[PDB]
């Protein structure tokens, strides 16, 4: 699936 | 962000856009701190 919930995609 | 980057439909009041490892880009929701595969600016899968 994927879709990094607001928590991972914040680099 | 005219001129300086930003060559697409501006993200709504509380949204962003970042590419995931899955292979496709998603839409981050600032309103509730989340993400989705479908863009809110229109309502179609990235």
């Amino acid at each position: 699936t994927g879709l990094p919930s607001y928590d991972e995609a914040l680099h | 962000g005219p001129l300086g980057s930003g060559e697409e439909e501006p993200l709504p009041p509380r949204w962003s856009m970042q590419v995931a490892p899955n292979g496709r880009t998603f839409f981050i929701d600032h309103a509730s701190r989340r993400t989705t595969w479908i863009d809110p600016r229109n309502g179609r899968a990235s």
Side-chain angles (χ1 to χ4, degrees), chain B residues 8-9 11 15-19 25-30 36-37 39-42 46:
Chain B
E8 238 100 77
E9 227 50 64
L11 321 128
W15 290 79
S16 270
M17 264 243 244
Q18 261 225 116
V19 58
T25 38
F26 47 106
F27 259 86
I28 295 126
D29 175 71
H30 286 248
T36 175
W37 286 128
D39 69 76
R41 38 153 102 162
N42 337 296
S46 238

Side-chain angles (χ1 to χ4, degrees), chain A residues 1-6 9-10, chain B residues 18 20 22 33-37:
Chain A
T1 64
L3 176 72
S5 46
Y6 196 118
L10 278 123
Chain B
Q18 261 225 116
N22 176 10
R33 322 115 234 170
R34 315 177 164 200
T35 65
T36 175
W37 286 128

